């Protein structure tokens, strides 16, 4: 068995995922492929954060 | 068995997912493919956050 | 068994993922491929953070 | 068994991941591939941080 | 006389006027006067301008 | 007389005026006066300008 | 007389005026006056300018 | 007379004026006056300028 188990929990996060699984090119001829001519990425532009308040875990296990 | 199990819970998050599973090109001839001519991405533009309030977990397991 | 287990939990983070799984090129002829003509990345531009408040874990295991 | 186990938890971090798994080129002829014509990366531009508040762990194990 | 006279014309401006003519206190006893307990002033908060287009004057005077 | 006269014209400006004419205190007893307990002034907070386009004057005077 | 006269014109400026005419205190007893308990002044906070475009004057006077 | 006269014109400036005309204290008893308990001044905080474009004057006077 197993008691008081956590698998990874995100409080208060922001996650960004992009081309996660690994792009593959095979057997192409006389081609130009580009992923981007113009790409823009901006995660925080002129920004203020304000706090993320307290994130708590309490476990008790007795007498197993 | 298993008692007081968590699998990963997100409080107060924002998740962004883009091209997660891994794009594949096979057997192309005399082509231009582009993912983007003009792409714009902006996650937070001129922004203020205000707090995310407390996110709590309480478990008790007794006598298993 | 196993008691009071944590697998890695992120409080208060931001995660950025890009081309995670390892792009592969095989068997191409007479091609120009580029990942980027113009790429822009900016994680924090002109930004202020404000705190992330306390992130707590309390476990007790007795009498196993 | 195992008691009061942690696997690595990130409080208050930012993680950036880019080309993690190791790109591979095999069997190409008469090609120019470039990863970047113009790439921009900027992690913190003109920025102020404000603190990350206290991140605590308390475990007690008795009588196993 | 006078020909082709201008007195000062504002194109495209914003003017702010506050306590212009000079406040005066005379003959007071046992008083607290304050102009402000809490005052807020913010001229441009998180703002973008866009241009003010061309502002032209043409005068001709002949044979006076 | 006078020909093709300008008195000072502001294009594209912002003017701020505050306590212009010179405040005067006379004959006070047993007083606290303050102009400000808390004052806030912010002229441009987190701001972008965009251009002010061309501001032209053309005068011609002939044969006076 | 006088021809093609300018008195000072501001293009593209910002002017700030504060306590211009010279404050005067006369004949006070047993007083605390302060101009400021807390004063805040910030002219440009985290700001970008963009150009002010060309500001032109052309005069011609002939045969006076 | 006088021809093609300029009095001083400011293009593209910012002017700041503070206590210009010369403050005067006369005949006070048993007083604390302060101009500032806390004063803040910040002219440019974390700022980028971008150019001010060309500012031109052309005069011609003939045959006076």
Residue numbers in the entry:
A (entry chain G), B (entry chain H), C (entry chain F), D (entry chain E), E (entry chain D), F (entry chain C), ...: 22 to 85
The authors write:
Following dissociation from MHC-1, β2m is normally cleared by the kidneys, but in patients with impaired kidney function who are undergoing long-term haemodialysis, serum levels of β2m rise as much as 40-fold. This leads to aggregation of β2m and its deposition as amyloid fibrils in the joints. Here, we created fibrils from β2m at low pH in vitro and, by combining assignment and distance constraints obtained using MAS-NMR with cryo-EM analysis, we solved their structure to near-atomic resolution.
Each layer is related by a twist of −0.608° and rise of 4.83 Å, giving the fibril a left-handed twist, which was verified using scanning electron microscopy (SEM). The subunits in each protofilament have an identical conformation that is related by a 180° rotation along the fibril long axis (C2 symmetry). By contrast, each β2m molecule in the fibril has six β-strands (strands 1–6) which are stacked parallel and in-register in the fibril core, consistent with previous MAS-NMR31 and EPR35 data. Remarkably, these β-strands correspond extremely well in position to β-strands B–F in the native protein, although the length of the fibrillar β-strands 1 and 2 are shorter than the corresponding β-strands B and C in the native β2m fold. The N-terminal 22 residues and C-terminal 14 residues are disordered in the cryo-EM structure, and β-strands A and G in the native structure which lie in these regions are not seen at high resolution in the cryo-EM structure. This perpendicular π-stacking not only stabilises each subunit, but provides additional stabilising interactions between protofilaments, which associate via the heels of two subunits, forming an interface that is unlike that seen for any other amyloid fibril to date.
